[PDB]
Amino acid sequence: HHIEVVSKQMDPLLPRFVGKKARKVVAPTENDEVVPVLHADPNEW
Amino acid sequence: LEELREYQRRKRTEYEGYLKRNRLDMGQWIRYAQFEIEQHDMRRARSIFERALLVDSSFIPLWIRYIDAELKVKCINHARNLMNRAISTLPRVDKLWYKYLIVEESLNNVEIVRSLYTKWCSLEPGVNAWNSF
Amino acid sequence: TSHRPQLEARSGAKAAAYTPTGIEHARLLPGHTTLKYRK
Amino acid sequence: KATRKIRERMLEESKRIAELQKRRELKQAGINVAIKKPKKKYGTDIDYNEDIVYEQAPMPGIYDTSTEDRQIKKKFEQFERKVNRKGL
Amino acid sequence: MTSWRDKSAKVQVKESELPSSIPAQTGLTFNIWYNKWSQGFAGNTRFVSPFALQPQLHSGKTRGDNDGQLFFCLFFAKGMCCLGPKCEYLHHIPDEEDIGKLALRTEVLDCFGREKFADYREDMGGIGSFRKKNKTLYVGGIDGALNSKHLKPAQIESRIRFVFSRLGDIDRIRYVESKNCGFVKFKYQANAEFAKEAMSNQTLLLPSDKEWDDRREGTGLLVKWANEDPDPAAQKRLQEELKLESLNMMVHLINNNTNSA
Amino acid sequence: QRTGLSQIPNRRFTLWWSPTINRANVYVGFLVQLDLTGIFLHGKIPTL
Amino acid sequence: DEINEPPPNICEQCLGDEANIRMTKIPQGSECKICTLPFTLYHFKTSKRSNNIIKTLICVRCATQRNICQCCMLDSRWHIPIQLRDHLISLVNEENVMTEEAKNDMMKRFLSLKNVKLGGAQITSDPSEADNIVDKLKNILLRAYASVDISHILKKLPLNESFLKNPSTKSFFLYNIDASIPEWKITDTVSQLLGIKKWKDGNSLSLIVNHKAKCGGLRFQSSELGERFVSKISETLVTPKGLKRGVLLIDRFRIFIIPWSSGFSAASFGTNTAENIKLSLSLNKLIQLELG
Amino acid sequence: QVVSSSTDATVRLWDVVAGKTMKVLTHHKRSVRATALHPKEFSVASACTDDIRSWGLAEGSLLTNFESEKTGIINTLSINQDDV
Amino acid sequence: LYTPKAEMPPEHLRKIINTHSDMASKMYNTDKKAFLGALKYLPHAILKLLENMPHPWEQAKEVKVLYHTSGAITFVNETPRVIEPVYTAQWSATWIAMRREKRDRTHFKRMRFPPF
Amino acid sequence: LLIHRKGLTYLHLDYNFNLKPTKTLTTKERKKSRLGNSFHLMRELLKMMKLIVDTHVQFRLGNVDAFQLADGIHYILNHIGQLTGIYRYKYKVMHQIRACKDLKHIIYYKFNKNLGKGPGCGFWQPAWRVWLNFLRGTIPLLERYIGNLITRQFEGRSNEIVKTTTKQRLDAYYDLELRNSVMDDILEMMPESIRQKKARTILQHLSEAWRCWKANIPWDVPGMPAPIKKIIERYIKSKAD
Ligand SMILES: O=P(O)(O)O[C@H]1[C@H](OP(=O)(O)O)[C@@H](OP(=O)(O)O)[C@H](OP(=O)(O)O)[C@@H](OP(=O)(O)O)[C@H]1OP(=O)(O)O
Ligand SMILES: [Zn+2]
Ligand SMILES: [Zn+2]
Numbered sequence A: 001h002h003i004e005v006v007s008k009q010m011d012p013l014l015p016r017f018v019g020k021k022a023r024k025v026v027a028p029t030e031n032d033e034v035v036p037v038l039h040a041d042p043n044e045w
Numbered sequence B: 001l002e003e004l005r006e007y008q009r010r011k012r013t014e015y016e017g018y019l020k021r022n023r024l025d026m027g028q029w030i031r032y033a034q035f036e037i038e039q040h041d042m043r044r045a046r047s048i049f050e051r052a053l054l055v056d057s058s059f060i061p062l063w064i065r066y067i068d069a070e071l072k073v074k075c076i077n078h079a080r081n082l083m084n085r086a087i088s089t090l091p092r093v094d095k096l097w098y099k100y101l102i103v104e105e106s107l108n109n110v111e112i113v114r115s116l117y118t119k120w121c122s123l124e125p126g127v128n129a130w131n132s133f
Numbered sequence C: 001t002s003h004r005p006q007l008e009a010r011s012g013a014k015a016a017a018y019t020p021t022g023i024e025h026a027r028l029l030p031g032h033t034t035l036k037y038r039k
Numbered sequence D: 001k002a003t004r005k006i007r008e009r010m011l012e013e014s015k016r017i018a019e020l021q022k023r024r025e026l027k028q029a030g031i032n033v034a035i036k037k038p039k040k041k042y043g044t045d046i047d048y049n050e051d052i053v054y055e056q057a058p059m060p061g062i063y064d065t066s067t068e069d070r071q072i073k074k075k076f077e078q079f080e081r082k083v084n085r086k087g088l
Numbered sequence E: 001m002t003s004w005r006d007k008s009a010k011v012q013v014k015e016s017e018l019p020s021s022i023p024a025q026t027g028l029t030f031n032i033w034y035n036k037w038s039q040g041f042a043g044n045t046r047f048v049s050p051f052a053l054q055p056q057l058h059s060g061k062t063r064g065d066n067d068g069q070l071f072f073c074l075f076f077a078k079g080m081c082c083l084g085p086k087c088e089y090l091h092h093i094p095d096e097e098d099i100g101k102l103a104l105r106t107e108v109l110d111c112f113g114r115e116k117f118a119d120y121r122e123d124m125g126g127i128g129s130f131r132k133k134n135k136t137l138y139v140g141g142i143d144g145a146l147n148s149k150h151l152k153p154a155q156i157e158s159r160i161r162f163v164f165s166r167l168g169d170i171d172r173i174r175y176v177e178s179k180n181c182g183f184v185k186f187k188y189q190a191n192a193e194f195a196k197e198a199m200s201n202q203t204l205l206l207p208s209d210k211e212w213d214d215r216r217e218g219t220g221l222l223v224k225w226a227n228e229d230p231d232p233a234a235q236k237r238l239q240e241e242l243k244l245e246s247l248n249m250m251v252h253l254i255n256n257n258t259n260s261a
Numbered sequence F: 001q002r003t004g005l006s007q008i009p010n011r012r013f014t015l016w017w018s019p020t021i022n023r024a025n026v027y028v029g030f031l032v033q034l035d036l037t038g039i040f041l042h043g044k045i046p047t048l
Numbered sequence G: 001d002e003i004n005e006p007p008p009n010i011c012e013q014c015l016g017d018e019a020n021i022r023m024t025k026i027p028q029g030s031e032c033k034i035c036t037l038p039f040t041l042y043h044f045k046t047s048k049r050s051n052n053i054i055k056t057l058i059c060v061r062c063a064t065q066r067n068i069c070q071c072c073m074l075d076s077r078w079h080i081p082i083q084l085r086d087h088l089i090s091l092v093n094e095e096n097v098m099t100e101e102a103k104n105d106m107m108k109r110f111l112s113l114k115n116v117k118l119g120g121a122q123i124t125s126d127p128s129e130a131d132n133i134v135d136k137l138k139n140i141l142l143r144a145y146a147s148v149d150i151s152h153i154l155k156k157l158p159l160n161e162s163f164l165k166n167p168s169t170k171s172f173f174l175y176n177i178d179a180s181i182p183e184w185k186i187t188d189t190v191s192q193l194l195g196i197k198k199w200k201d202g203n204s205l206s207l208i209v210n211h212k213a214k215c216g217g218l219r220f221q222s223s224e225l226g227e228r229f230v231s232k233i234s235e236t237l238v239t240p241k242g243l244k245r246g247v248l249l250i251d252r253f254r255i256f257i258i259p260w261s262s263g264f265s266a267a268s269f270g271t272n273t274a275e276n277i278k279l280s281l282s283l284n285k286l287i288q289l290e291l292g
Numbered sequence H: 001q002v003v004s005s006s007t008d009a010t011v012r013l014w015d016v017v018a019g020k021t022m023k024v025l026t027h028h029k030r031s032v033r034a035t036a037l038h039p040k041e042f043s044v045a046s047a048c049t050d051d052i053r054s055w056g057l058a059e060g061s062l063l064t065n066f067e068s069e070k071t072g073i074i075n076t077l078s079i080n081q082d083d084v
Numbered sequence I: 001l002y003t004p005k006a007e008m009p010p011e012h013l014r015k016i017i018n019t020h021s022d023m024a025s026k027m028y029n030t031d032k033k034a035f036l037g038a039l040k041y042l043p044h045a046i047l048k049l050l051e052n053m054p055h056p057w058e059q060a061k062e063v064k065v066l067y068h069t070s071g072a073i074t075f076v077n078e079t080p081r082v083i084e085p086v087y088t089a090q091w092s093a094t095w096i097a098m099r100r101e102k103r104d105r106t107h108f109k110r111m112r113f114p115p116f
Numbered sequence J: 001l002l003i004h005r006k007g008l009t010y011l012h013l014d015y016n017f018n019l020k021p022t023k024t025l026t027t028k029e030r031k032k033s034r035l036g037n038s039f040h041l042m043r044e045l046l047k048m049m050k051l052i053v054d055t056h057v058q059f060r061l062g063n064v065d066a067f068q069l070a071d072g073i074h075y076i077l078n079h080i081g082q083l084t085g086i087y088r089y090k091y092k093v094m095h096q097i098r099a100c101k102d103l104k105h106i107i108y109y110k111f112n113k114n115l116g117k118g119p120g121c122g123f124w125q126p127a128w129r130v131w132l133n134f135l136r137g138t139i140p141l142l143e144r145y146i147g148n149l150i151t152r153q154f155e156g157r158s159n160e161i162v163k164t165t166t167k168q169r170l171d172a173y174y175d176l177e178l179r180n181s182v183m184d185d186i187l188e189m190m191p192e193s194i195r196q197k198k199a200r201t202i203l204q205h206l207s208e209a210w211r212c213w214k215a216n217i218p219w220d221v222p223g224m225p226a227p228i229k230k231i232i233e234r235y236i237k238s239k240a241d
């Protein structure tokens, strides 16, 4: 078709970012793979 | 069944309430993993072993018991392509190379150890490893 | 036995905002806005 | 502190056993009443029975299996079927 | 048609007859943010509706018909709408013509235009789910609806059958005496959604039923969603209708590949 | 009960000089009335 | 900066026929119906003068993992529900594949951030992979209670009457209706065979089917429609030492007709459900008697 | 833009505009206490206990291992203009 | 472009404020959040009201205002601008009118506070 | 609407902007209904305004005459300490209350030359300016404070609050830094033994070596390795310094 993207102008008295609220989010492990690690005395210590 | 179902519900709150405050204590990760193995649930048990490799991935008694979880139930390719991660993580560790050899010895295919020792001698280990070859 | 601090990022990935909630602190108000360059 | 929490544990252990003997006896009269939810304290509380807790899938290995998985669900469906009758 | 297409929709309730937005009296002081009564104990604050839907009398053409509105007036379903022919929503029962226009939108919305939710609810209340197409309406509160007089369970079944019959294609009805529960399945999702709003908090008793003067004191008949059917005959019948509707779209999913080539 | 100091001497002193301590003084916009009495309190004074 | 960079997911059916459509972007609009996190929301109207505004309900991350439209919640390739798309793929493959949903409010919050995928979407996203299964669909299309007594009920049933083709009443009796066949399909064919379309708004006919007693009861209005119904019933069975019955012909299922002339009132078929199961077994013997 | 060393025995190199790690140097066996950049050569040195290694910053590439055996815990590192 | 603001009837602002006396309908839920957003700007509206107060020689003052269309807040949109020799003559004329009245009246009664 | 959204319907707000309890409160309700200064400073400010506005309403109703209107406006502005409780919430406004009292002393003596005593001086222009200038500084502060309170109502209070090193938590924070710094230096001298079990034992010797320095007793552990002994001694001397 086509898409024209327009930002709407907000009421300055309304709570801006009506989705915004303090929340805790536990985040998963990132997608990139694992790097290789590449590396008598017990009676003393 | 609810004699067992609320049993399984109650135990999972007790171990994960503890691991919440102690991400460390690798002994509790293994014990809580072994509980889910005995429930005949390998989907949940593999999750706990993957979640525990995130906390430490150099504690190789965690690695070995996750191979033992896979071979006792005789799921073989999950323990095979695991080793594409395990020794590509820690190439210097002796026991991770030895265990993936001797398990292949009991599965009797010596075409596979013909390519394992190929890399493991290109890697220049040292005297105790060259002599077993 | 404290045994471990809190890693900062577990706060930083929280989805309040990139910013805090929208609290305006008195010490984060503008001041000393012109940097000084040496010759 | 330590003695109180052991005594308060065995009190809490009694409240289940008194409850679970009610349902074993209510099964005898036929009326099946389920176990309730232990109501959520804060807003974002978890039920660890209902889902996998923090489901981390293992890896995308080159050694595609797609054969053992069948046996795993066959064993698990065999297990809870034995729980459904023999009661462990 | 005879009821709907020729007429214009009438006004069920005048605006001066509309009920007060303030609820009755639950506690000591009225909270003006949440619009509730505070400081005390609530007293089982449900109540029956003073009004109801009259399908043949109240249907007619609306301004939503001339504009091309998809959705139905929820206050028409309740029997409360005060606009009449001015209202921007449809005042008639959903039918196979309009439901064909509720095809792309009905997956996530209901027939009134309200979004559906992922989880159902702990008590299977108001709106539906966008995971499961549930065409069966639970009926409860039948003791409260009949105003605590006695009837035989065969006669209760018929009194449920009649008032639900007008609201759309009724698949099946099976009143249970062991659990006083009505399981009313329709042909369409959109007629179950319409009937759930329309008969919620109503009275079953008829004007000749000797308690028509006193029926407002009740609680009405609860209308929630119905759970999965535990008897194994319908579960195999569920498996049957799953398979045959699958093959119907096995035909069309190789026709749009045939169009693709 | 062994170490803490008794309240009863402060209350004794304060009650004695209470028409001067709780005097009407200057108007501050309102006055607080003690419940179930008609005693007005002309400051926030806990010992009184 | 991960919020605003990925693009939206709208199918061509939601978006319409219009050339160029203006949309509204709100960077912290509603929260996702699936993941319950704030996300950027989009408004559009298909035409410039529509009554209805279309709104993205789920975020782009939850839509990518299911390969679905953000509004339809239908498939991006096949435009079918997820409750169906797994079941069709479960037929082509001998494995069973589903889309699991997280109940816990934080675990569903955890679930949306992983970038793998789940369910049938791993098939339906790839063009080459999805074509092989639609190909295999064609090959499948090539493959093509005794103790309770019910006596007082059974006397009211007019077990022994004919299509005498007289006016009689509006009221008829139906049986051999099996656990199948919703009441609308009966009342459609009766309206289709009598010829009247839109039977329900006219309120010409009334049906009671009990579905546990396996028998059904029919009422008409304006009795001249009633004999016209009998005038359209072609199939008969002249029972050998009995009275004839007209037969309704739904697909593969047979429903036999007697004029009532005194039957009505719910209790007619059975008071409780077990009393209907006993009447099911009573008629199952009598239908076997009727055919052989 | 930013080089960092921590007690998890790794040295990380950072892409700051993408906010992510360009390279992870994993060769040190214990906690890496000290770093110093060369003033001329565009390289970083890092020290672990008994282990001092130098690195080129263009690639995650080991330049030299040092004769730092038996030297103990290293607290600080300093590079001079004259390659000291 | 830029056309300036439409000057609206003063009855339009009255009707909106008389409507928002009793907000029990659900139609008022977004406007209630606008009353809490207006609370940050209330000491600014107080300053505009109090600097534009009538002086004792004028009976009534008409002021330009700016109001939110939900009637949450009204700002007085003017500045009290004076000619300084005229203004000093205005107050000093008021000064002498006030000194004659205190001499001339036998008993001056003072207003009661608060007035209501 | 703010008082009701909190749930505080036992708190009554009258039309002269007094906040009145209606009831005896529980301990739980008393903790819940404490309002900040930003609420109460906003309320006292509405109360001064409602006061002045209603003085103009009485004249426009015809209850008072023009001379009484000027005397009442001039009375409010010199008695804001007596009429509102604005100083309870931001006490620096006593500068403004004392400057209006100073201006009233110099104005009353010009106005009442060869006149008597009693009301009737409505020259309110100097004290009006004092309150207009006070507003100038109160706008930015209340804009920030009311903005913070209102943001907490719709979005919540963040869970990422980092508390600073103040004088009441200084000894606790010194503890955690010395405890982490001692475990670092000892775990880097150990070859490859263990990290979890020995660690609690090591910090018990540190706390014990500090009780010995304070008691002036020598700290000798007979089978302790010499490099673990020199790290604990170095860090005990640093704490003692
Ligand atoms: O305390 P006093 O020596 O009797 O002085 C009073 C007092 O003024 P200050 O206390 O502010 O100096 C009165 O003020 P309040 O007692 O009401 O605070 C004031 O009366 P108003 O301010 O109410 O007008 C009155 O002045 P007057 O009697 O002219 O009204 C004035 O007496 P002096 O004019 O002798 O100072
Ligand atoms: Zn309407
Ligand atoms: Zn989402």
Ligand SMILES: [Zn+2]
Pocket (backbone or CB within 6 Å): G010, G011, G012, G013, G014, G069, G070, G071, G072, G073, G074
């Ligand atoms: Zn779509």
